[PDB]
């Protein structure tokens, strides 16, 4: 598949908003491994356990690993916005609340592979957009 420009744009906005990229266009150098490991873990262990692992805040991690889940949430919200609204569309388009954590959201609304597909594309977009910045 090709690279979706709109998803890369959402990734840029979400990376800036969720405080992964500093003002001098830099990141703490552990986040690229975080995103690549997130993709691999989603493939190898399943969506819910990988989301729980990377969304955990009581971790002995080098940096704030839970910020990548916020970036994922922002990208998914942005792409669910501008979803076309036709009565033949399989997509939900309902926006994930900022109150909700990602894991509970997938638990209580998770019966369809729409979230899996959107998360895979969002992770790929994060991976490709983070290459535009430098690592401290």
């Amino acid at each position: 598949m090709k690279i979706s420009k709109k998803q890369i744009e959402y990734a840029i906005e979400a990376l800036r908003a969720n405080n992964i990229i500093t003002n001098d266009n830099q990141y703490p150098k552990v986040f690229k491994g975080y995103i690549s490991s997130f993709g691999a873990a989603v493939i190898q262990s399943g969506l819910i356990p990988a989301i729980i692992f990377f969304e955990n805040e009581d971790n002995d991690a080098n940096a704030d690993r839970h910020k990548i889940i916020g970036v994922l949430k922002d990208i998914i919200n942005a792409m669910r916005q501008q979803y076309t609204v036709t009565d033949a569309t399989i997509l939900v388009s309902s926006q994930i609340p900022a109150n909700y954590s990602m894991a509970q959201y997938i638990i209580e609304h998770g019966n369809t592979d729409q979230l899996l597909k959107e998360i895979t594309e969002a992770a790929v977009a994060m991976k490709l957009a983070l290459r535009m910045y430098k690592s401290e």
Binding site: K2, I3, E9, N25, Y133
Partner: protein, 591 residues
């Protein structure tokens, strides 16, 4: 007082009648020679010439190319109109006698029908005007505008008597298709030589290096330093019409030199050039008191040095005169590629404009005025390709793209060409296209009024392998070509970013090529980034306002708007991609 202006003939139709480059050069030199013969009696009578500067330099054969244009303006004294009239058919009888000669192949002739056919086909028009001015500067536009409308009168041969074995009437086709002569065995033991005709005798003579011209592959491979022409002429002369066998033999001999053969030796570059807006240059040389003879001098010097430089590179001029240029050059020749030749011709243009028009540049362009410019159209094709379609591609690149006449023509066909939209017309462009053996086209357009052209030339010269040496050149990464194509949207996002695009581009290239093998290609990555940024800046400065006025011009439909709207970043990406593909195409051999 009296002025006489002459338009020469149907150049376009005669060019279209041709089939290969020999016929094309013969057709161009036919009109050059006709103009030469027509104007020689007046030049020897020392008339005051206004449109061209017919000094002694043009009359000397300069590498077998046509310098004489199709338009001339006289200063007439009473008694030259009728002698021009008589010389008009004197030349026709002379040409009829020249064609009716056994030196050319065929079976007998007849001068009378040749003369009638030539008078029916060749349209010699001359206008006489008695205007009140002794100033050439209003004289030449006034005569030119009348000549332009005079051109549209159709004289043609009504009956054309063909086949029936030989009752030929297509005498210009006869001349162009048989213009080099016959193989002329000379003995039992000879090197074969072509006979020659009035065109190739008025051209280069017999001062060594005069082994005329035949086929295309010796043009496209004039570096291998083994004799294409004789090595292939021996093969045909060892057996029992003119070009196809020796062309067939030539590909055989070239293929037989497989050890040093490189793919570009079978690809031929057609170079067409035209002067960028010289009528307005005349007008500005107008309001500011400067003679037009300086422009004539500059164009003369540029033409002579252009012929010299083209023949130095290894190319065959077809017509260089006035503001117009057409040439046949190899893809590569002795460490110089075609773009080096284009840059050298451009520099010759600027040098001649500087030398002769120093008053105009020193007085006008510094305040605010575009300098005279030259636009280039280059097409590279297989040798076994239709010549007519190759010349159509070159004309398309030069006019529609390089001169942006597609913009002007789409706007004028629907009558939208307001002055504000005419302010957005663009010149000074290099239109380049390459068609492989398959059909894959690499086309791009670049502006020569900036550092992007300079950096493009330096990148080509830097990363092209030089076989002639054997010490080394900076190595090339072929994976960058596919990265540019695949990552084009992300690159567009980077380019559209303001005041952080340089650092972002550097970061992207470093983070994508993060392996130890890429430590050697940092120079290539840096050059690519610099060229891409320069091209994006040029493209925005050239196209942003033009696109935003095209977008909300509610006279054009969406299709023509989309064919007219150019994305700056995407065009820069395409240009860099095409340049890299050209580098790879020149570098890659299939041993």
């Amino acid at each position: 007082m009296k002025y006489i202006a002459i338009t020469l003939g149907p150049i376009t139709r005669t060019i279209e009648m041709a089939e290969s480059t020999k016929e094309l050069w013969a057709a161009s030199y036919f009109f050059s020679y006709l103009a030469k013969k027509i104007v020689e009696p007046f030049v020897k009578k020392n008339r005051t010439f206004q449109l061209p500067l017919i000094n002694e330099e043009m009359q000397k054969p300069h590498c077998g190319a046509g310098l004489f244009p199709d338009r001339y303006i006289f200063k007439s004294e009473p008694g030259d109109l009728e002698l021009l009239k008589q010389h008009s058919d004197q030349v026709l009888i002379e040409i009829a006698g020249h064609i009716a000669s056994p030196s050319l192949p065929g079976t007998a002739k007849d001068v009378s029908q040749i003369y009638h056919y030539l008078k029916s086909y060749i349209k010699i028009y001359f206008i006489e005007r008695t205007l009140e001015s002794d100033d050439p500067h209003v004289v030449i536009p006034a005569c030119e505008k009348y000549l332009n409308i005079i051109e549209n009168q159709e004289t043609f041969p009504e009956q054309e008597e063909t086949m029936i074995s030989h009752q030929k009437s297509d005498f210009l086709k006869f001349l162009i298709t048989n213009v080099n002569g016959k193989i002329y065995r000379k003995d039992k033991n000879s090197i074969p030589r072509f006979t020659g005709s009035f065109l190739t005798r008025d051209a280069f003579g017999d001062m060594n290096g005069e082994r005329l011209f035949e086929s295309i592959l010796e043009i496209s491979a004039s570096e291998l330093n083994i004799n294409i022409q004789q090595k292939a002429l021996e093969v045909i002369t060892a057996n029992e019409k003119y070009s196809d066998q020796i062309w067939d033999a030539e590909e055989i001999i070239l293929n037989d030199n497989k050890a040093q053969l490189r793919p570009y030796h079978k690809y031929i570059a057609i170079i067409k050039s035209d002067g960028d807006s010289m009528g307005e240059t005349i007008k500005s040389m107008g309001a500011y008191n400067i003679p037009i003879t300086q422009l004539s001098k500059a164009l003369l010097s540029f033409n002579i040095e252009s012929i010299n430089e083209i023949v130095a590179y290894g190319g065959k001029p077809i017509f260089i005169g006035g503001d117009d240029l057409l040439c046949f050059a190899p893809v590569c020749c002795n460490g110089n590629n075609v773009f080096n030749l284009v840059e050298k011709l451009s520099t010759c243009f600027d040098q001649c404009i500087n030398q002769h028009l120093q008053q105009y540049i020193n007085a006008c362009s510094e305040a605010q005025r575009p300098l005279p410019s030259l636009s280039f159209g280059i097409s590279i094709t297989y040798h076994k390709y239709p010549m007519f379609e190759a010349l159509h591609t070159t004309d398309y690149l030069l006019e529609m793209v390089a001169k942006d006449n597609l913009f002007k023509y789409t706007l004028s066909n629907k009558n939208i060409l307001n002055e504000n939209m005419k302010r957005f017309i663009l010149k000074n462009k290099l239109a380049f296209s390459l068609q492989k053996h398959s059909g894959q086209i690499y086309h791009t357009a670049m502006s020569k009024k900036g550092k992007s052209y300079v950096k493009f030339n330096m990148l080509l010269q830097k990363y092209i392998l030089k076989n002639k040496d054997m010490q080394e050149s900076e190595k090339f990464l072929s994976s960058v070509i596919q990265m540019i194509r695949a990552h084009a949207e992300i690159l567009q996002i980077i380019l559209q970013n303001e005041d952080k695009r340089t650092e972002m581009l550097k970061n992207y290239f470093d983070n994508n090529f993060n392996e130890s093998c890429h430590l050697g290609y940092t120079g290539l990555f840096e050059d690519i980034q610099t060229l891409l940024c320069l091209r994006y800046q040029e493209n925005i400065q050239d196209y942003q306002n033009r696109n935003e006025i095209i977008q909300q011009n509610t006279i054009l439909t969406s299709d023509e708007k989309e064919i007219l709207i150019v994305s700056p970043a995407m065009d820069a990406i395409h240009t860099i991609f095409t340049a890299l593909q050209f580098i790879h195409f020149i570098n890659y051999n299939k041993d």
